Every structure is written in C-alpha cells, then in structure tokens.
Amino acid sequence: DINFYTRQVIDPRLCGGLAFSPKLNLFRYLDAMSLSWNRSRLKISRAT
C-alpha cells in the first residue's frame, strides 16, 4: 500500500518555454517608429 502526494516545478531552465514568449511580435513591432518620437521631442525641445 502506497499513498502520498508530491508537487514538482517545471524546471524552467529546461522546460517552461515552449510558449509564445510575448516578447516577440511586439519587439519586432513598432519599437523603432515609436522610438522615432525623437522628432516630436526635438520639436518641443526647440520651442522649450
């Protein structure tokens, strides 16, 4: 007769990925043109 309970991690070093990793599809996304708001910042700084 054996009766006990255990809980184990998903060892995220090995497993834990295999997902979408929402970094991508957003880092390759507008991060450049949104950064390009340097144009507007320069505009406001000129009149500042």
Binding site: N38, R41, L42, S45
Partner: protein, 48 residues
C-alpha cells in the same frame, strides 16, 4: 555576426548654443537703491 542590419546607427540630439552679455562700464550697484527718503522723511536734511 549575421545581423539583418549592417551598420549600427545612433541619432543623438545635438545641441549647441553661444551667447554673450555686452555690459558697459558703469555702476548698476549701490546707486540702484530705493528712494532715500522712503518712510524716514522725519529725519531733517537738505544736503543729503
């Protein structure tokens, strides 16, 4: 390095400014004082 972009590009906000004062030889100092009588007209004087 097998990178999509061949050259690293930086866009520094470059700002230069030159300015002068052009003050003449004069005495904006002690002479820049409030009315000598002020509220002490009770003190008698004619030469001051």
């Amino acid at each position: 390095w097998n990178l999509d972009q061949e050259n690293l590009v930086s866009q520094p906000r470059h700002n230069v400014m030159v300015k002068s004062k052009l003050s003449p030889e004069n005495n904006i100092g002690k002479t820049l004082s409030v009315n000598p009588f002020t509220t002490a007209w009770e003190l008698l004087t004619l030469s001051f």
